[PDB]
Design a protein around this nucleic acid. Structure first.
Lengths: 128, 53, 187, 147
RNA sequence: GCCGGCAGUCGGCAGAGCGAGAAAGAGAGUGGCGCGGACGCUACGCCGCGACGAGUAGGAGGGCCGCUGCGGUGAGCCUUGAAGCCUAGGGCGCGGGCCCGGGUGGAGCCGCCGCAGGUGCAGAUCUUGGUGGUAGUAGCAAAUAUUCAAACGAGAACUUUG
RNA sequence: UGCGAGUGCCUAGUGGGCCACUUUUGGUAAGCAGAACUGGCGCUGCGGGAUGAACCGAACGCCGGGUUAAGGCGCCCGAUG
RNA sequence: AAGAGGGCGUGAAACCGUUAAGAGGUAAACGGGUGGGGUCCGCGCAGUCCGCCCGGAGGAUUCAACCCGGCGGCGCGGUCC
């Protein structure tokens, strides 16, 4: 068992695959980050059948199912112990998340403090 | 190429004005230079008025 | 598909004032509630006029207020203005007044109080008349700006009296071919 | 603030907001007010009439100091003096008629625009208008010149 | 888009409503035991209906998209490990991109409110620098010619001697 | 019969077009040149015409079910096996 | 700390060498949809708790109501000073 969310709806996503920039497979200098094709004769731009899909507003997730983990919590970045007590009224639907720049000496103090306030930490054993 | 109701402007920028641009960053330093010489002028003539005759 | 022209789908009326000040937004906050709760249409016009721009709510001269408040029927009556109250130097006598505005100039403020008048603000207006009963709503000259004299029909067009865009007024900069019967033609 | 400029939103668009068929060349129409009579004649005719040609006589050494003549109307006449001057009028059973020196404030000619309140005055100015006099004389005042 | 709704959380100082076919008030008067009631409202916020959603040149709006530096701000992070880089790890956002886990690294760095710009690349027979296929390929062919034995050496078709 | 209307400022881009039912000029004719109305491509994806500018249907936020237009139902290829 | 070894702070990509896995006659690569195989993750593998009431088993120097002292809110005290 662990710290369960207050409510656990069925998280549904209209598209789970990432959006791939055109011709990023052929070349190396073209990154995975999306760029809108603005050419005059482009198969992607005028939406030819059997091509890659362009990101539109219709691919947006439901407002109720947005920004949760598969566990059902929202992330919130945490730097020190003083920023952990703000989530004392949101532990049933929000989880604490430790930054990459937190040293292992005071990372243990945040974890055991979060146990006392019953706040879920998505990375409870990172540096050990 | 004027378009849709501007004034017929005559800018006097057809010369090479960029060689003769006079910047005024000397203004606060010139004010101190004039003032510090004004106080020094008034101290050489001790009983005489600072403005002059 | 549906054949609907979408070019006029979005109305271009104002929703929120563009100013970032907090006193105007508190006045908007006060009159937002009164517009959608009370049945008085006076509060809707004030809320609509509290969203205008500075060139959209022109200053109201003091003498126009005197001229518009000496009409029969409006005695013991308050005047509410959305713009600003400015003094007029070509008026001598000023009666007792009751004026409500966002801002009154210092010269016009001392003139009203000297004659026994009363200058109120819009927050005190809601405490006095939340429905705006017994109020007269006035506004300044919308077309009184110098900008509107350059509008309308273009110059160099017959029977048009638009001021041209001229850098400085002189004898030889204009009033020549295009304006004179002696020089080519005139309109 | 370059971050609010239109150029930041145009990053990515090939033509940069200046057309695809006709590119933004150097000077398509000509530099400055090129072609007042040719190929830009319609814009100069229906927006700046009377731009071309001579009119009137030429005055070579024209000095603005000779033609200096600031004007003031009768409607803004009691603002030239203090408030306690005019309230000490139409009183004391004398007809005090205070003297307002127009030249003293920095105006020369007095014009007749506006309505004058009923109080006889004495006005000292270098110039006067015909319609200026009949308003003051109609009220009951008198005009006195000065050089 | 709605003259959209929500300041009404008006609680032993209380009575918890104004979806309801019909222009207006769950209005004041005067004669005949048990201390109790979930959420909220960054009103630049929250919530409810209806309609619609293509797009070149082009225009407008929103970016809690991103880079650099500055004024504040986080009793901010950091040699018990900062920036940078890699990653078949976990993920988030439609998307710009962003947050963690592991490895290298050793010294500075990040969020928010505003400010400023030399601020975002796939091309320009672009500039600089580096690296591939071609490819162990074309080639090492103008002027007749080298051979034998010994010496030096670790090593001799090319050096030396006969 | 249906639709909430009027009005004022700036303002980019455009100023090489093309095709088709019908009318029609020159030309023997032309995927030729030049006109009128309307609709399309330009700027537009989708089903169909094997293939495709302009042909027929039909115009597009992301999906599930159902039903069709034009086309089709021997196999490729869903459907008259 | 040479996983800092004299052009030596880190050491990216293009490119190449080697190892592990997989595949290979319609050039390669891509989108939608699945399936299979991997490396890791959920430190999973008798499966979440939160309040009220009921039953029997145990423990405090404890509940309500009173006394004193201190603090705080309100007071149209109809109209205290």
């Amino acid at each position: 068992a662990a710290l369960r969310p207050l409510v656990k709806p069925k998280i549904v996503k209209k598209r789970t695959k990432k959006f791939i920039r055109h011709q990023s497979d052929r070349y190396v200098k073209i990154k995975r980050n999306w760029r809108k094709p603005r050419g005059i004769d482009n198969r992607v731009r005028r939406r030819f059948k059997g091509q890659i899909l362009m990101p539109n507003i219709g691919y947006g997730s439901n407002k109720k199912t947005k920004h949760m983990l598969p566990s059902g919590f929202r992330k919130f970045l945490v730097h020190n112990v003083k920023e952990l007590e703000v989530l004392l009224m949101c532990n049933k639907s929000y989880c604490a998340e430790i930054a990459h720049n937190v040293s292992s000496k005071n990372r243990k103090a945040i974890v055991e403090r979060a146990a006392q306030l019953a706040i879920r930490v998505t990375n409870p054993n990172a540096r050990l | 190429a004027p378009s849709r109701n501007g004034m017929i402007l005559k800018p006097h920028f057809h010369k090479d004005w960029q060689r003769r641009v006079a910047t005024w960053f000397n203004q606060p330093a010139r004010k101190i230079r004039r003032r510090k010489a004004r106080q020094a002028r008034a101290r050489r003539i001790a009983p005489r008025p600072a403005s002059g005759p | 598909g549906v054949d609907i022209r979408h070019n006029k789908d979005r109305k271009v009326r104002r929703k929120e004032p563009k100013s970032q000040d907090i006193y105007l937004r508190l006045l908007v906050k006060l009159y937002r509630f009164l517009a959608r709760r009370t049945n008085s249409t006076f509060n809707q016009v004030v809320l609509k006029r509290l969203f205008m721009s500075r060139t959209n709510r022109p200053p109201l001269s003091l003498s126009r207020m005197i001229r518009k408040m000496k009409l029969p029927g409006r005695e013991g009556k308050t005047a509410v203005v959305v713009g600003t109250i400015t003094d007029d130097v070509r008026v001598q006598e000023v009666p007792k007044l009751k004026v409500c505005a966002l801002r009154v100039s210092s010269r016009a403020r001392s003139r009203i109080l000297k004659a026994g008048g009363k200058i109120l603000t819009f927050d005190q207006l809601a405490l006095d008349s939340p429905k705006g009963c017994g109020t007269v709503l006035l506004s300044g000259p919308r077309k009184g700006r110098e900008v509107y004299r350059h509008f309308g029909k273009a110059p160099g067009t017959p029977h048009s009296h638009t001021k041209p865009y001229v850098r400085s007024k002189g004898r030889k900069f204009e009033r020549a071919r295009g304006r004179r019967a002696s020089r080519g033609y005139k309109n | 603030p370059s971050r609010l400029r239109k150029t930041r939103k145009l990053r990515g668009h090939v033509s940069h907001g200046h057309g695809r068929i006709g590119k933004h060349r150097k000077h398509p129409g000509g530099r400055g007010n090129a072609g007042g009579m040719h190929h830009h004649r319609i814009n100069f005719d229906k927006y700046h009439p009377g731009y071309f040609g001579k009119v009137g006589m030429r005055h070579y050494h024209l000095k603005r100091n000779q033609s200096f003549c600031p004007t003031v109307n009768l409607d803004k006449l009691w603002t030239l003096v203090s408030e306690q001057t005019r309230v000490n009028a139409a009183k004391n059973k004398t007809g005090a008629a205070p003297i307002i020196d127009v030249v003293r404030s920095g105006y020369y000619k007095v014009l007749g625009k506006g309505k004058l309140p009923k109080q006889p005055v004495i006005v000292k100015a270098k110039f006067f208008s015909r319609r200026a006099e009949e308003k003051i004389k109609g009220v009951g005042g008198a005009c006195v010149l000065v050089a």
